[PDB]
């Protein structure tokens, strides 16, 4: 049942006497029993990818062959916990070893077996009942926010022979006994699923519901949807980590799986410190955010091979909650660090590289990862509906959107949130370029917007036309010097500035821009566009008369309005609720309309 | 009838990426097919890439995960992947390997065809002539498509190339003075797009004549290497044996090229530009050229393959080699898309080789050829004027430059811009062409003979 | 008399097509006839050489082409000219060769364009801007040359 280590080249270990080993089986390498996974088979020798530092591993060390592939333990006890790249809980390690360092070769159960879970059966099953994969036969109350559905694992079925009565059970007991054809199966609350295999769904459905983002831009102009996939290929300093963390804090999803794959250690601590202090009311009661989130830490200074396990562990967890009828919006804040791990391993393997040193199969890995997102009809008699969204960062070197990872990613994701380093230098956050970005879900959500708002869509169009016209002008204005500009063009240029400075950017570390409810975004946009139309009409109807209302005339006459328009961001939706914000915006619109009547 | 029992081997030498290497094999046949039974009972297939002595390298289509080097059983079929084909494959949806995905039965083997293709004698090839009236002014006017042509649609990521291809399929037809069968090969296509085409065919009632082969982005990346060969093999049966006219759509040859690159790297082949196999040119030619008409038949195959252009360039080896093989392109651009123009097709870098012969008196209108050339030159100049204006300003242009700028803006608004649910005929397209040409005084229309101008220009 | 070979034909025949054509050309040259040989493309021939060079796992040169690409082109291009034929009749024939370099661009760094330019005496370059303006035939008139001026002056 053992092989022996033949050689070590770093993250890749070669072992012998493993003739019967299959690809993607787990092994235990060394006397510390380090976790690894077989990549290649050459005769009776195996190529092992090791997820822990290989320093100190000797030739001749035993290698245990484990039949089970890389897999994730799925059951109650996930929410609120932080995991490493292979699902070893960090709060349980630190509570057991008393160390500050993560030891190598730690064998810790993914889910604690001491917790007595509150379990209630569905009360709809009886002995002799026929149950199939995805069926729910009870719920465990992990906390007050997420109700943890106990599902019959996929690839399992049979007749019920026993169901545990309602009561307090831990993860080592038997809750459901079912039999199929003589063979009987005993299930606890925890199921095991290979992390590289996609959990099966009844049907993949189109995404027709917004994924709410606490941002003005990245929502009004480039919407994302529940079940959609987006990329943020920002250069360092562009603020893409802040966008991802902001989306996690303030969204309309039920569960967030945050994957820190190659991220700085300080960023994962920031989540652990800040999240417990955040609130989201459920039904009149104040509750913390952490009870509905989970996160995976595989920091930059951890084993590079573990970066692949982290990405797949994250999405696998996301699917599990998807299957329970929750809307999941997981985000891996790196992607490039995963592709980087593939490059480093491919090198040690002496594989033939493709574009810029990356493996030829890079596109294959990214495509199959992102396609696990989507709104689905779940398997299981209870007819659940769920989704997994993926918001993945990319780290192009130099900010040049030409590397194999950014290029391949853009061909996969349907929403492109490109960031511009030159906007971040000006602290124009979020640093969204708004010229190269796009969203292919605009048409999908047009139905939603018409039902709830109507006014939003023509405002979105007018705003894009203004921004595009300003860019078309800036290209030539830099050369002319604002000498040949018509009065109608100066209005575009100045209103476009109004939009850029007050609407597209917001300071996410303030009490007023930390969250921007959608109704506020469309409200203040309506005023800015209404000003545009009134200012443009004012000059268009007077330019041919005996007194043309040029920018300098409207600017001096309405200078108070232009300042008020810029102040519209400072509304603090937590202190001043919807009623005050709408009344304030409505009053400014009336004030403007009266100013034009006295002007023209 | 090959009534000879098959050999099954457990003599696996090793597994490396998508490739499984076998030893101790009796008289290996090149490009043979091997059925793999994994220790857990999973069945998968693969095709031999090379043989040497008692060794063979097998390309596993469904994937190699789970294969060991001791128990996996490898059954050699003794033949080349000849696939079952039937005239009643229309109205069916298959996966990337030609298996049912639509809850229907396995296709009944009316006959078998070697998917590698049987070369057609150029002496019996019939030159295409008849125009297909696609409904899209950017195509029917300038870069017309003949039936039997090979005109791929290039695009970069994010552009509406799936909508244009769908529009052509439902608006396809001939210039009149009955319809096409569709063979749709999806290679690396996401689920949202797959449902886009599947629903569009159903909503228009076309499925009665559509055969889909779906290899999705979440499906195996080796399988898609045969997918395009299975699609064209069916097209060849339907067009050359069943006297049908078949329009073949290939959703992305770029994901196909990537699949070849993955294999090429896995077998440590010497690459050419950007890591792709040095034989990319040949492997594409053997797929693209499965088109056209043959003497003695009434059917035809028209191909309109789609290619995603990495980094929005057109020098990438994939579109570079394709351009050398296919008879022009459409080339969907991004600058038109950013301006909310649909279809965002850029007429300048896109040509149609058969255009010079598929138009003119007896096929469309006497003036077709002259209108196209004049519009092209005017547009090209307008872009050179725009390039100058961007530097010198609108106040530094002469009267003629302003005419070309006026043409440029009106050309894209009135001629190119159409909408996905409106079709215009070739004759309506030319009438619009004239409306754009009549912006200029006749003296500036230097690419139209005076005889043509006198007949049409003053109307 | 044409020689027909399409892009979907085997790479070995794609390479040999040029050799077959010139062999027929020389055959009639030795009859005292003036033979004019038109190539469709020499980039397709060079492409065949690149594909085979890779398959043979021999060390490439620029842009993946074999380092001996120039030697193959010289062998083809130098099999031409007005000659005194072998045989008692003292007859004199000729072969003219018109090559065809498909332009990946106007940059003559292209290994095939560059090797051809160093060999051929007459180069009729086709301007991209004149083609875009539908000025036909499209000839640059500035980058083209013909080295037979002094020969034809008589």
């Amino acid at each position: 049942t053992f092989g022996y280590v033949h050689g070590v080249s770093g993250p890749v270990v070669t072992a012998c006497d493993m003739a019967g080993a299959a690809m993607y089986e787990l092994v235990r390498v060394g006397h510390s029993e380090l976790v690894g996974e077989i990549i290649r088979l050459e005769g009776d020798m195996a190529t092992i990818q090791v997820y822990e530092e290989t320093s100190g591993v000797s030739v001749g060390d035993p290698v245990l062959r484990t039949g089970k592939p890389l897999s994730v333990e799925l059951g109650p006890g996930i929410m609120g916990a932080i995991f490493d790249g292979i699902q070893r809980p960090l709060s349980d390690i630190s509570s057991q070893t008393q160390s500050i360092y993560i030891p190598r070769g730690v064998n810790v159960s993914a889910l604690s077996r001491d917790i007595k879970w509150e379990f209630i059966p569905s009360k709809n099953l009886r002995v002799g009942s026929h149950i199939t994969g995805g069926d729910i036969y009870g719920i465990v109350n992990e906390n007050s926010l997420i109700k943890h559905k106990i599902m019959l694992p996929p690839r399992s079925r049979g007749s019920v022979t026993y169901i545990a009565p309602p009561g307090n059970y831990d993860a080592s007991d038997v809750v459901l006994e079912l039999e199929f054809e003589g063979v009987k199966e005993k299930l606890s609350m925890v199921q095991v699923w290979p992390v590289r295999q996609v959990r099966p769904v009844t049907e993949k459905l189109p995404a027709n519901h917004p994924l709410l983002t606490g941002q003005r831009v990245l929502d009004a102009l480039f919407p994302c949807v529940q079940g959609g996939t987006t990329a943020i290929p920002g250069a360092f300093g562009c603020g893409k980590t802040v966008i991802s963390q902001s989306l996690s804090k303030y969204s309309n999803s039920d569960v967030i799986i945050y994957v820190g794959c190659g991220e700085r250690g300080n960023e994962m601590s920031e989540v652990l410190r800040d999240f417990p202090e955040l609130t989201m009311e459920v039904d009149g009661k104040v509750e913390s955010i952490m009870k509905r989130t989970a996160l995976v830490a595989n920091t930059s200074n951890m084993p590079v091979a573990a970066r692949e396990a982290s990405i797949y562990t994250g999405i696998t967890l996301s699917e599990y909650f998807r299957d329970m009828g929750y809307h999941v919006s997981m985000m891996a804040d790196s992607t490039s660090r995963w592709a980087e791990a593939l490059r480093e391993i491919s090198g040690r393997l002496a594989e033939m590289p493709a574009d810029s040193g990356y493996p030829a199969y890079l596109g294959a890995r990214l495509a199959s990862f992102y396609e696990r997102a989507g709104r689905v009809k779940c398997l299981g008699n209870p007819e659940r509906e769920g989704s997994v969204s993926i918001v993945g960062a990319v780290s192009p070197p130099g900010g040049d959107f030409s590397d194999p990872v950014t290029s391949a990613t853009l061909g996969i994701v349907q929403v492109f949130w490109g960031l511009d380093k030159k906007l971040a230098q000006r602290k124009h956050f979020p640093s969204v370029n708004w010229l190269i970005s796009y969203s292919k879900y605009m048409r999908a959500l047009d139905e939603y917007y018409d039902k709830h708002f109507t006014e939003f869509v023509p405002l979105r169009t007018k705003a894009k036309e203004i921004l595009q016209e300003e860019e078309d002008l800036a290209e030539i204005v830099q050369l002319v010097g604002k000498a040949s500009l018509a009065e109608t063009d100066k209005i575009t240029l100045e209103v476009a500035k109004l939009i850029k400075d007050d609407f597209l950017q917001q300071n996410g570390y303030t009490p007023y821009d930390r969250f921007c409810p959608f109704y506020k975004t469309v409200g203040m946009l309506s005023n800015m566009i209404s000003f545009y139309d009134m200012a443009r009409r004012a000059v268009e109807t007077t330019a041919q008369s005996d007194n043309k209302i040029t920018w300098s005339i409207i600017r001096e006459h309405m200078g108070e309005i232009l300042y008020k328009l810029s102040s519209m961001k400072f509304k603090d939706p937590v202190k001043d609720g919807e009623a005050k914000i709408k009344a304030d915006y409505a009053q400014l619109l009336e004030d403007m309309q009266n100013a034009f009547r006295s002007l023209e | 009838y090959l009534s000879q029992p098959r050999l099954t081997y457990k003599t696996v030498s090793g597994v490396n990426g998508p490739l499984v290497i076998l030893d101790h094999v009796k008289f290996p046949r090149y490009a043979e097919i091997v059925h793999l039974t994994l220790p857990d009972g999973t069945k998968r297939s693969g095709q031999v890439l090379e043989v040497s002595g008692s060794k063979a390298v097998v390309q596993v289509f469904e994937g190699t995960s789970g294969i060991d080097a001791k128990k996996t059983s490898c059954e050699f079929t003794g033949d080349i992947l000849r696939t079952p084909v039937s005239e009643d494959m229309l109205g069916r949806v298959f996966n990337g390997s030609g298996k049912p995905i639509d809850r229907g039965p396995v296709v009944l083997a009316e006959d078998f065809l070697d998917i590698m293709g049987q070369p057609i004698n150029p002496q019996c090839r019939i030159y295409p002539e008849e125009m297909i009236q696609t409904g899209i002014s950017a195509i029917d006017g300038m870069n017309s498509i003949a039936r039997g042509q090979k005109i791929p649609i290039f695009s970069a990521a994010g552009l509406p190339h799936n909508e244009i291809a769908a529009q052509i399929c439902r608006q396809a037809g001939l210039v009149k003075k009955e319809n096409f069968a569709i063979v749709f090969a999806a290679m690396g296509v996401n689920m949202e797009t797959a449902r886009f085409f599947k629903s569009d065919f159903e909503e228009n009632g076309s499925m009665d004549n559509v055969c889909l082969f779906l290899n999705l982005a979440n499906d195996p990346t080796i399988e898609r290497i045969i997918t395009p060969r299975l699609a064209l093999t069916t097209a060849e049966f339907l067009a050359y044996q069943c006297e049908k006219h078949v329009l073949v759509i290939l959703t992305d040859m770029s994901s196909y090229a990537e699949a070849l690159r993955e294999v090429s790297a896995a077998r440590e082949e010497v690459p050419g530009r950007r890591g792709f196999p040095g034989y990319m040119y040949t492997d594409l030619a053997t797929i693209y050229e499965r088109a056209g008409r043959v003497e003695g038949r009434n059917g035809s195959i028209t191909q309109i393959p789609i290619l995603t252009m990495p980094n929005d360039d057109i020098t990438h080896p994939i579109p570079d080699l394709t351009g050398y093989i296919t008879e022009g392109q459409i080339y969907v651009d991004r600058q038109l898309h950013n301006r909310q123009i649909y279809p965002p097709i850029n007429v300048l870098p896109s040509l149609s080789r058969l255009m010079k012969s598929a138009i003119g008196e007896g096929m469309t209108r006497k003036d077709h050829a002259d209108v196209s050339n004049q519009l092209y030159a005017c547009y090209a100049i307008g872009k050179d004027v725009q390039a100058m204006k961007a530097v010198v300003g609108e106040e530094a242009l002469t009267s003629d430059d302003l005419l070309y700028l006026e043409f440029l803006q009106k050309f894209e608004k009135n001629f190119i811009t159409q909408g996905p649910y409106e079709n215009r005929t070739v004759y309506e397209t030319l009438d619009i062409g004239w409306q754009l040409l009549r912006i200029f005084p006749k003296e500036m229309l230097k690419r139209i003979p005076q005889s043509t101008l006198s007949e049409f220009y003053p109307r | 008399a044409l020689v027909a070979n399409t892009s979907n034909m085997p790479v070995a025949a794609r390479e040999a097509s040029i050799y077959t054509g010139i062999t027929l050309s020389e055959y009639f040259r030795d009859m005292g006839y003036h033979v004019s040989m038109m190539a469709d493309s020499t980039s397709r021939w060079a492409e065949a050489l690149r594909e085979i060079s890779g398959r043979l796992a021999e060390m490439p040169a620029d842009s993946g082409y074999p380092a001996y690409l120039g030697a193959r082109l010289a062998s083809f291009y130098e099999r031409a000219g007005r000659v005194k034929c072998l045989g008692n009749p003292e007859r004199e024939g000729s072969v003219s060769i018109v090559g065809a370099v498909s332009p990946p661009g106007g940059d003559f760094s292209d290994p095939v364009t560059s090797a051809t330019l160093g060999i051929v005496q007459v180069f009729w370059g086709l301007d991209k801007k004149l083609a875009q303006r539908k000025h036909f035939p499209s000839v640059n008139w500035l980058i083209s040359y013909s080295k037979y001026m002094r020969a034809l002056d008589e």
């Binding site: 002496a350 033939m352 590289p353 040193g357 | 010497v270 690459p271 890591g275 | 796992a57 060390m59």
Partner: peptide, 19 residues
């Protein structure tokens, strides 16, 4: 350059195995 160098080294390695 990288890919070509590794190709040359792999060829030499194959040759050594044959001896």
């Amino acid at each position: 350059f990288y890919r070509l160098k590794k190709i040359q080294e792999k060829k030499k390695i194959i040759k050594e195995k044959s001896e």
